[model samples]
Target: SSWWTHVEMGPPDPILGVTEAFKRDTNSKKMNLGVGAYRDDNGKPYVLPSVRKAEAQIAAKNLDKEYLPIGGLAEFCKASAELALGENSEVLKSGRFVTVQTISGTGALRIGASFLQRFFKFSRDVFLPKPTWGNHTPIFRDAGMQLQGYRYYDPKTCGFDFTGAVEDISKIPEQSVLLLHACAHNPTGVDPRPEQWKEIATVVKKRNLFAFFDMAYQGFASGDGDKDAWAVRHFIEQGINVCLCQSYAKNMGLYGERVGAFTMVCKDADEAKRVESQLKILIRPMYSNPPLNGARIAAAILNTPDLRKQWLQEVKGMADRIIGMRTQLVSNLKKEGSTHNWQHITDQIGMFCFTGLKPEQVERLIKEFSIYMTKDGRISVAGVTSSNVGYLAHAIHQVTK
Candidate 1:
């Protein structure tokens, strides 16, 4: 007899599955606004020019395929931390930082989640935003932690629900883990102002909560890495001991390579060492060790002066392109006689724009038009090109009007 046939079909992934469906449809005009990956003006997958140069440089070196240490590349993690926190960040200077290389932001989150599950004695509940990256819930839940939501997005205004978020966060039991998007929140591009972040930090400090920050976009959000990292750095300055997850996928265009780091800021070096030991033990059974190629590539670019400058410029280019798209989209919508308040299209920052289109309108966009996006009305601004902006705007206008 054949092996078991009791397995059931797993549900499609909320994020990546859209890409699979979009690929199967042969419609020449089909638009995919599902994935967060950036696209060029030609509506093609963008690989940073700096990455290509680094790859060529690595190829010239003829590096051997060697197993990395359980922790991962030291240079990569160091640079990642510096990029997220400032170069002279107090957390790093005090030797209270523990950094480990992981699969990417997702892997970092998983490792952090596992560590919290195994060690955190205060709470088993993880507080995430009411509207956060879809993966956060599952990542924490699978780690044996109960997940709860803190209010975030305000659908009526299509912006941040600041008061609601504060109220919800304050109500979560003290010492609970709170996951925050350091910059450029996913799905919805809304973010708290600097003052708002200070207020958030005060609440977390007063409540003695563990803050876990996910910094996936980094430089990709604002075209300047330091600018995008203001919130994380600000919290640290306020004496908050935070955990951070960094991804090179967006900033370095190393999406497939899965380069990232998970770092924890403790009160002192002794605590950091203890955390590091525990992190290695947790990661060993998971993947043994992370891949070295992506980390190596990332390290090469970040450590080298000229290459680092080139990489920053390349990231800025991608960010400017997205910003350009946002402007064109809003302008085109208005030009198409859209009576709705489409100003949010331009006001929102980062790679995605929440169009405020209803679920039915999104479906109409798919069936009637060839545009494809999640039902939540979020569109990847990076997907819109000069060639298709007018057409997309017209389609949106038709559905909304």
Candidate 2:
């Protein structure tokens, strides 16, 4: 059995490789802006106070370790979907949507990709933004769909290439999948303006494309869940049925627990029923029911009126902290007199900023300045604490100069 090598080694992952490099750095002043998880002002992983409370509440119940249904616990699924579609959604009132609890946002994407591959009437090719999340390409590719890119970022301006995106979407043939960020576009942090989103939606509708929404940073975008979800809700309002994926990892600080949900809006109640049945079948064989502890903790928080209200406030605290870091970075960079506009640091929302640093400059920062980030120059603004912003700004200035 051990006579021959069974499988070849896979290529190193871009982001994880970054983490490995950061770990190997011995410099006392070393900085790692590579990974995208949120950190507190102290540069430590944050745990929402609401999350701790929920954990305690679930522990008090002494809940059994029973396996959840293929769809997962009903309380959280309803609360999670309601969180996405809004508490007053007429669509939900009419039973026209189905929400299935997933392992997390990544799991949600995989499930949606597979479901669409098997059942979607559209073309099997899915289009992503030119600079979409790193994991998206692999997720769709493994699900057996052709991957295509639409222009989104402008390296020159470090901003959205709206015109190019619109042009590309217009030329795409009818009936395909368009994976969209519901809020806070990743890697770049450059999201479309509300007006821009409306324009893009119009183009997609004309092409009759299916909208697959990934809403990973809902409350983090603007510290308001409703505001962050405006684009996705607006699409559904305009009679566009959408497939939605949500994650509590960043927003809820449940990174290890991996809580999330995937929902699909259908034409009517019967269609929702059909989709729900099929989703259960697809999930049953894969993981054979979801984990109970994380769902229980999240479900309790979502279900309790007081706990839900408190959690929203806690989410705003986290979002506001990130925004403050963004402001600090921009301020510090400008003070360093690097001559770059650096305004994009403040413009980009959520946990990251695309700094427009070239690979060579990024290398210089790592070797000469003890600062480590991905070669793409995308920095995790969440990693910037009040204490480190000045150091980060100086290092960035040195490299750019």
Candidate 3:
């Protein structure tokens, strides 16, 4: 008998499976709204102009193929930290933080999880926002930490459940880890207001909870990187030392390039030095070192003044497109006589929208309209185009009616 005979077929991935099904459809007007990647108004995958410029510059350099350090590129790490921590940050000035280039956001989370599994000196529990990105559960669980949820989204009003979140957070055991989406909460796109974040910080401090931030989208959310990083900065300003994950996937259109970083705010430069040594030891066996090209490209863009300015404008352009799509979707729905109170469509921000469509409605959309999406009723706003938005609205109205 074969040694691998006992292995069974695994179920299809929830998000990727949608793309597989979409490929088999023969409809001329089909839409694949399940993808999280950005698309232009022309309904095509987008590559930012800034990224193109950086790539061309790198090509001109003819750089060596030497392996990066176990902690990856130095300049890339420094640039990534400043991008999230702000150029004039006290933490940056104090040199009390560790930043390392990672494979991407997923890799950063994996590394962070493994580090926590090894060194966290508290309850082995990591709490996430309820209805978070589907991947989060497995990431923490696989790291041997028990996973739980704090109330976040409210289905009744299609908004944040502030009351439930605060109550649940207050009850969490002290010294546990709490994962916060730094901005543009995945799947729901709902975020806490600045005042609400202050209250959350108060409770986190009161409970002595460790803050773990997943900032997969920075400039992609509000068209301004600093504004999007407000929460993470606020927590630090409140003296909450946070470990963070960052991705260049959406904002820089570096999805396939896998550019990202993981950072930790330490109590002092001495502590940061010690922690960074351990992080390098932990990373050596995992991937040995991260890729070179993506880090080089990211570093080039960030380090160069003109390219950096160009990148900022490009990020804002992408965010503006996403914002415009939201407005257009709602307007088109209204034009299609959708009286179903679709205000949440405009309220939600970023790449995805928690569309509030029922499973049956979603099924009808797929069966009759050839519109592909996850069963949770979330749709990637990037998939919507000016040409197909009216058709999408008509289909939604028909399914609802």
RMSD of 1: 1.4
For each candidate, what TM-score against the reference? Answer: 0.97, 0.97, 0.98
Distance (Å) between predicted and true CA of 351, model 3? 0.5
In candidate 1, which residue pairs get closer than 3 Å at backbone N, Cα or C atoms, i.e. clash? none
Q: What's the CA error at residue 211 for candidate 1, in Å? A: 0.7
Q: Which parts of model 3 are misplaced by more than 4 Å? A: none
Tens digits of lDDT, candidate 2, 228-267: 9999999998888899999988988888898899999999
Q: Which residue pairs of candidate 2 clash?
A: none
Displacement of the residue 218 alpha carbon in candidate 2, Å? 0.6
For all candidates in order, the CA lDDT equals 0.88, 0.88, 0.90
Cα lDDT of model 3 by residue, 100-212, tens digit: 88988989998999899999989799999997988898989998888999999999877789999999999999999999998889899888888999999999999999999
Q: Is candidate 1 or candidate 3 better by TM-score?
A: 3
Ranking by TM-score: 3, 2, 1
- Please tell me which predicted candidate would have the highest TM-score against the true structure: 3
Q: Residue 347 error for model 2, in Å?
A: 0.9
